């Protein structure tokens, strides 16, 4: 499952970079995600903080609530890349929090949960636009 694996790689890498501080298509997607994932947090820091508090994530594995949230976000039937990147960015915000409380925390369950929602529930929507190419082009700046 190339799309799942590619997506998980991009999302896992971003979450890990965010939480710790520390092919080419996947690379361009990750570069875009760094830029706009960081971008969407800007101005929304208070909102993200408030969401994190309500989310009340218990540990690295406690992803069920976030998954329900993500499914609910999409439950109006609208799908776009702004929503998707906001969910990933919030995921990174949550991952950063999990590491802050326990530095031995793995971001992997969170990244897998996010990727699951995106790839399983929007599979064909992603495939029709050649996956992450839609993301790269949507957020492409000249």
């Amino acid at each position: 499952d190339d799309l799942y694996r590619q997506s998980l790689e991009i999302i896992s890498r971003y979450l890990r970079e965010q939480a710790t501080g520390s092919g080419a298509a996947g690379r361009r997607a990750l570069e875009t995600l760094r830029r706009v994932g960081d971008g969407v947090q800007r101005n929304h820091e208070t909102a993200f903080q408030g969401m994190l508090r309500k989310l009340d994530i218990k540990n690295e594995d406690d992803v069920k609530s976030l998954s329900r949230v993500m499914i609910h976000v999409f439950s109006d039937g609208v799908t776009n890349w702004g929503r998707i990147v906001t969910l990933i960015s919030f995921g990174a915000f949550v991952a950063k929090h999990l590491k802050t409380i326990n530095q031995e925390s793995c971001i992997e369950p969170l990244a897998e949960s996010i990727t699951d929602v995106l790839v399983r529930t929007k599979r064909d929507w992603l495939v029709k636009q050649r996956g992450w190419d839609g993301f790269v082009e949507f957020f492409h700046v000249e």
Partner: peptide
């Protein structure tokens, strides 16, 4: 309610951010 509150805010921000880049 908490999950719905979180989802409402994520959707608002996502759609905002989408419109920003769609423009």
């Amino acid at each position: 309610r908490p999950e719905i509150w979180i989802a409402q805010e994520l959707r608002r921000i996502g759609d905002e951010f989408n419109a920003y880049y769609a423009r």
